[PDB]
Amino acid sequence: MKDFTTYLSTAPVLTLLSVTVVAGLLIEINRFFPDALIAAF
C-alpha cells in the first residue's frame, strides 16, 4: 500500500491524473455553461 500510493504520486501518474481531472472539469463546465464568449456577471 505505501508503495502503491508512492507509485500513484509519481510524475507520470499524478500528472496524467491531474490533467484528466482538469480536463473533466472544463468539460463539465462547458457542458452546463456552454457557448460563453464573455464574462457576463
Ligand X SMILES: CCCCCCCCCCCCCCCCCC(=O)OC[C@H](COP(=O)(O)O)OC(=O)CCCCCCCCCCCCCCCCC
Annotated binding site for chlorophyll a: 28, 31
Residue with smaller CB distance to ligand X, 4 or 32? 4
Interaction between residue 1 and ligand X (CB under 6 A): yes
Strands (E), 1-41: none
The amino acid at residue 3 is D
Residues in the chain: 41
CA–CA separation, 7 and 24 (whole Å): 23
By Cβ distance, which residue is nearest to ligand X? 4
Residues in binding site = 28, 31
For residues 2 and 31, which CB has a smaller minimum distance to ligand X in the complex?
2
